[PDB]
Amino acid sequence: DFDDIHRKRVEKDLNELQTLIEAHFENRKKEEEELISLKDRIEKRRAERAEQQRIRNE
């Protein structure tokens, strides 16, 4: 019936929406991984600046 096609329509709506939800999940997740690697190289930079600054000060 009209309820059947309405149900299939909201169904495929839920499907595409959860698909895009998991999709942006993955995208923002990759972005968070990149940002974590950024923080890690950042702490590497902190440590290297600290050691070279300390050498200079020595």
């Binding site: 709506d13 839920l14 929406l17």
Partner: protein
């Protein structure tokens, strides 16, 4: 977020449809039972009229 809202909306569409169907079925039961009981009363009056005719 994003998918969570859509899933909630689906769960709400199911809610509305199920609740509406339940209410409509309840109204149908009320109407049908009223029909049956009025028919039974008509049958009773016919029995009494038959009794008077027998007398």
């Amino acid at each position: 977020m994003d998918a969570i809202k859509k899933k909630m909306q689906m769960l709400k569409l199911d809610k509305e449809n199920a609740l509406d169907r339940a209410e409509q079925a309840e109204a149908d039961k009320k109407a049908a039972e009223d029909r049956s009981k009025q028919l039974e009363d008509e049958l009773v009056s016919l029995q009494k009229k038959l009794k008077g005719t027998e007398d």
